[PDB]
Amino acid sequence: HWGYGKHNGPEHWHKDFPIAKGERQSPVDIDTHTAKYDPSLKPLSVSYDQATSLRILNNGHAFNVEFDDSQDKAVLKGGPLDGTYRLIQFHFHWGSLDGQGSEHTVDKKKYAAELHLVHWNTKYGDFGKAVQQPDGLAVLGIFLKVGSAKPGLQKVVDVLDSIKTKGKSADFTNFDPRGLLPESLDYWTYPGSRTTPPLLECVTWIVLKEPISVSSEQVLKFRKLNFNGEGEPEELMVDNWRPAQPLKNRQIKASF
Ligand SMILES: [Hg+2]
Ligand SMILES: [Zn+2]
């Protein structure tokens, strides 16, 4: 099955998922001089005071922190979106080295990691129906750079030993996602897709301009996770990022 290796990496995905070469594929390189400042872009509204985390799980390609999305507890609105979007999960993409790890690039600059807060359009009623619409999903992309430790991220780092292999899960309540947001909400936006198979084209991307800093030891813990299940040969969960894809006419707008 699909993965990030030489025999099943991103270059091979198109064979099982033909949309890999579609018209609105993600991630992309954000060219800062070609991006369009759009004065009609409303400021993003992040309402996460009521977020309820439930668990953390190693799904084999990343680790997901899941939230209860049966009510409008943690939502995204404003910016380029129309309607309310509920936070369902968050995950990261990181590299083997500090020089790589992000999926999106800025003027070709690669960051150490990239956080994705996934949300789905409430008029569709469930996440499953959402992935059947062109505006089904909204993903907030936050860049991580290595520097000082991010206090807000440590509870996450500390639970990683418990879900080291694929399929492992752990209760993870009372986690507040607010602790992972940069100071400014200025962003770039474009129409795109999920970055892992099925690569469905239903995502409105909101990429934050300011990165968050994490310490070297924080990122180190991410790299200790395994792609494999318990009892299998160890494969370190590193470089689970997809390369930049062709913009193909699409326009990247800026909120600034
Ligand atoms: Hg879609
Ligand atoms: Zn992602």
Swiss-Prot record:
The record marks 89 as: Involved in the binding of some activators, including histamine and L-histidine. Changing residue 59 to L: Reduced activity. Changing residue 116 to E: Strongly reduced activity. Its EC number is 4.2.1.1, 4.2.1.69. The keyword Acetylation applies. GO terms for cellular component: apical part of cell; cytoplasm; cytosol; extracellular exosome; myelin sheath; plasma membrane. Changing residue 196 to S: Enhanced p-nitrophenyl acetate esterase activity, but normal CO(2) hydrase activity. Substrate binds at residues 195-196. The modification Phosphoserine is found at residues 162, 169. Its cofactor is Zn(2+); Co(2+). It catalyses: hydrogencarbonate + H(+) = CO2 + H2O; urea = cyanamide + H2O. Catalyzes the reversible hydration of carbon dioxide. Can also hydrate cyanamide to urea. Stimulates the chloride-bicarbonate exchange activity of SLC26A6. Essential for bone resorption and osteoclast differentiation. Involved in the regulation of fluid secretion into the anterior chamber of the eye. Contributes to intracellular pH regulation in the duodenal upper villous epithelium during proton-coupled peptide absorption. Belongs to the alpha-carbonic anhydrase family. This is Carbonic anhydrase 2. It comes from Homo sapiens (Human). The lineage of its organism: Eukaryota, Metazoa, Chordata, Craniata, Vertebrata.
